[PDB]
């Protein structure tokens, strides 16, 4: 923001501005399950079919 | 004439295949004592009426 408008007190000074930043990394996520191959072979009923 | 070992020794001859299947003992003997029956199944269940 611009600086507050002050009365002059006899000579004008110099101000300045504050700029400031905010970085932020990617991250990597992961989720993973291991099956028998057998039970899906012999899933006559379905049970895992909503996998 | 005057011939190299190399090129004696070197593949002149041809490669045949009658080796191969000699010793090939005829499988399906159990045949003969056993029955085969398809499961397409994780386990069989046999049950008969008396």
Known sequence: QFPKLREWIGQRVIKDMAAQGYQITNKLFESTVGVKRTDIEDDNLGVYGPL | ?50
């Open chain 2, 1 to 50: 004439a005057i011939i190299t070992p190399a090129l004696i020794s070197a593949l002149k001859t041809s490669f045949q295949k009658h080796f191969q299947d000699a010793l090939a003992t005829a499988p399906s003997t159990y045949l003969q004592v056993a029955t085969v029956i398809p499961s397409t199944t994780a386990s069989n269940t046999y049950g008969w009426l008396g």
